[PDB]
Amino acid sequence: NVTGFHKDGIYFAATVVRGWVFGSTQSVIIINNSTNVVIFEYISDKHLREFVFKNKDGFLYVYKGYQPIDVVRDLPSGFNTLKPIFKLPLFRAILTAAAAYFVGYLKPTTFMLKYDENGTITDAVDCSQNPLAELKCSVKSFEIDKGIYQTSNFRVVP
Amino acid sequence: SITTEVMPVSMAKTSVDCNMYICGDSTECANLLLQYGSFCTQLNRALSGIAAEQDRNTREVFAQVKQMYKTPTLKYFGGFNFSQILPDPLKPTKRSFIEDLLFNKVKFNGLTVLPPLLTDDMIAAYTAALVSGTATAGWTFGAGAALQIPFAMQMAYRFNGIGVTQNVLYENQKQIANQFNKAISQIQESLTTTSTALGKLQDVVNQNAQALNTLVKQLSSNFGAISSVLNDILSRLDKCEAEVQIDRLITGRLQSLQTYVTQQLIRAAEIRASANLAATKMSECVLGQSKRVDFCGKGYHLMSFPQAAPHGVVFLH
Amino acid sequence: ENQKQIANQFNKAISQIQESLTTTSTALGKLQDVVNQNAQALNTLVKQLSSNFGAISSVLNDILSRLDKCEAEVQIDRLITGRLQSLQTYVTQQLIRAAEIRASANLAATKMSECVLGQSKRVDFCGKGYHLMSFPQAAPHGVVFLHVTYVPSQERNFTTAPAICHEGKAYFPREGVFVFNGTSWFITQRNFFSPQIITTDNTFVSGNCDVVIGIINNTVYDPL
Amino acid sequence: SDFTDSVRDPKTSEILDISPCSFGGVSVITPGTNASSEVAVLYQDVNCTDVSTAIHADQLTPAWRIYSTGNNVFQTQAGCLIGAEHVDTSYECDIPIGAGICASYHTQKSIVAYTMSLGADSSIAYSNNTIAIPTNFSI
Ligand SMILES: *[C@@H]1O[C@H](CO)[C@@H](O)[C@H](O)[C@H]1NC(C)=O
Ligand SMILES: *[C@@H]1O[C@H](CO)[C@@H](O)[C@H](O)[C@H]1NC(C)=O
Ligand SMILES: *[C@@H]1O[C@H](CO)[C@@H](O)[C@H](O)[C@H]1NC(C)=O
Ligand SMILES: *[C@@H]1O[C@H](CO)[C@@H](O)[C@H](O)[C@H]1NC(C)=O
Ligand SMILES: *[C@@H]1O[C@H](CO)[C@@H](O)[C@H](O)[C@H]1NC(C)=O
Ligand SMILES: *[C@@H]1O[C@H](CO)[C@@H](O)[C@H](O)[C@H]1NC(C)=O
Ligand SMILES: *[C@@H]1O[C@H](CO)[C@@H](O)[C@H](O)[C@H]1NC(C)=O
């Protein structure tokens, strides 16, 4: 589920000056311009661009991506992966300048990724979505012939 | 004179959860067991294969007819009284007298016993159809299509197969019928009086019970740790002094579970050999007459009737 | 009398089994199962090599490039113990599987020794029905038999009788049974309907027709 | 096996028996991912009124996020099935389940469960003065 605007790490995507703030409110500032990037005053030098933020062990990972999309009000269903860009040793974000941004949440779950020859990420299916998905995740193959299989054990949490 | 011969076919299907047996409900114990990477899925796969092998054994033994036959309304074929072998419609249960007197003669650990694919009535239906086909269609219903023969002429043919001419049978049929009825009554009395005649099936059940009991009892040892209960370890130590005790419990319980799996594999191999022998015995002794000496019964062989048994088959040669 | 019909049935059977072997994909289940079991054992051994067994790292060269010769000894000991356990488990599973394959090989050996080089009178050991011969063929890590069988069909009802008597003497068939046909009686064999006239050549005498149940009054042709 | 089974209550001095609440192995039955993508789930040896209540209260540790079905529940002696419809007609067994139940993928198609079929049923008539003789054969 994602919130359309026409905890433990958040997901960002946006269809334009974009800024971020992080704190318990001295201030942690991230400002992205058209050409320059300004960030502990670290200074460095349609379409859909995706930033993945995560935080563990006193470190914060920032990942970036890019994909050319079609001009439409919602977001089309598609497949793309994003590479890491940087990592730093140290939730709502404001942007300004017809524009939209969407936020999804992160959960600790297991995936299973299919590579290829000359291969980036080509296909992936989740391991905690469907019983068929759990079966694919357990037999460790994309094609399962007819039969009965045992995957895991069920238990009721008190 | 008729004689009995008991064989095992299948043993008790079972399964063991690796995460429930070794660790309790602590997720850190799941992490420490995941350090011993990809180990306890092998045991579960082996026991699943064992259960599939048990179902294969029962299916390969009993289901050797492509069609079945209705139980005849009359149980008297020329002086041969068959009321003790074929099932009777009076009882609400559809089992014969021999089968009914022979069936009556013999959690916190994640242990489960899966039910068999075929129930008792399933096997009883197979046995009743097979016996009726022997009694009516003669020796040609598994070797091709069924061909109905009167019982006296089939007896004459089987005597001719032994080496005795037909006139010997047809001159003294009543004496042979009386001997047959006395033999059935004698074997019924011998089955119902004593308590030790089904040794092998009781031995299989007792061996499986002893293995499960000694596994459950071996769970209760501390393996050199300060206590034998994992929850008492996790309620009395921090996350660097309890790790070594958890490691010792993991190692000991892993050794015990691996030993139980190996013993189960060897025992299943022995039961598979017995099941294949029983399958070829019934395929070469009920559906036909065997000229191999001393393979079915003592002396010369005429025919044989199978009966069901708890995890087994009982022949009457 | 009907060699050409049997030859045509033989050729149709060979063509049918060739088509059935070439169309489907699941007929050689057992050899594929053996290969897949061996591959799974090797794969899980190689994957189990990649675990650390509670040590600080799962690569031995990384242990020997980051510790001295008294702090790396305990980690080396843990790797030795874990990999020893894995290798011993693989050896035990291989021994049991080899025992199963040895049993199957002995069964196949005695099957071909008692079914190709000779004709077996054991029912339902080679093929369904009666057995004529068998041809072996090679297979990847195995042998494939082609048993040829002779099965009867097109059954017909008849009226039968145990024995007949002509002048106070019981007559019993030599090899075969008595069939009424709706006409005068005939003698036949038990697997193919080919009637013949009752004659003293294929019939033998024993006793009188007073004690055997179901004697029929009928004539016995003597060839003079 | 040195297991805490019964406890005297430390305050009112009554008797409490301790049992482990429901758990077991789970299995999935599929017709193979070449005909469809719908599967069915078998929960082993539980009277799964408990399982239905606990999954409508969202307390099962196998976290099926989008899977929630309670319209097709069938009870067997090996456990209970969610995702299959009970059919009284007998057919030859396609995949084994236990206690004489076999699932299959016959009729639009769906997963159906039924009772084991013995085979081709027939009945040969007996008479004590009739014989049967074949007249033809096929190699
Ligand atoms: C066969 O034996 C049973 C044994 O109780 C008996 O009841 C029945 O009458 C017998 N059948 C006869 C004598 O035809
Ligand atoms: C033989 O006769 C019986 C009754 O007379 C009949 O039910 C049966 O079908 C017949 N057999 C064949 C092969 O026609
Ligand atoms: C058998 O009976 C038929 C009449 O149904 C008759 O035509 C035939 O000749 C008989 N068989 C022989 C060998 O005579
Ligand atoms: C066949 O059974 C009937 C039924 O009792 C009997 O009357 C007849 O005598 C039997 N047939 C022969 C040849 O004995
Ligand atoms: C303990 O406390 C309970 C709760 O107030 C009280 O009912 C009880 O009398 C006290 N004493 C004992 C011995 O249980
Ligand atoms: C399951 O429990 C309910 C209520 O306790 C009961 O009515 C039902 O019969 C139980 N199911 C079985 C198979 O015993
Ligand atoms: C056996 O059946 C085939 C096919 O129906 C037929 O051509 C052949 O003539 C039959 N055999 C005899 C001996 O009639």
Numbering used by the authors:
A (entry chain A): 65 to 70, 84 to 92, 97 to 106, 112 to 125, 161 to 166, 180 to 224, 231 to 237, 249 to 309
B (entry chain B): 703 to 808, 836 to 1046
C (entry chain A): 900 to 1123
D (entry chain A): 556 to 662, 671 to 702
From the primary publication:
By cryo-EM, only symmetrical S-trimers were observed for SARS-CoV-1 S/x2 and S/x3 spikes. The S/x2 spike adopts symmetrical locked-2 and closed conformations. The S/x2 spike can adopt a symmetrical closed conformation, spike protomer of this conformation has an empty lipid-binding pocket and disordered FPPR. Therefore, S/x2 closed protomer has almost identical features to the S/x1 closed protomer with a disordered FPPR (compare Figs 3E and S5A). Under native conditions, x2 disulfide is more resistant to reduction by DTT than x1 and x3 disulfides, likely reflecting different local chemical environments for different disulfides.
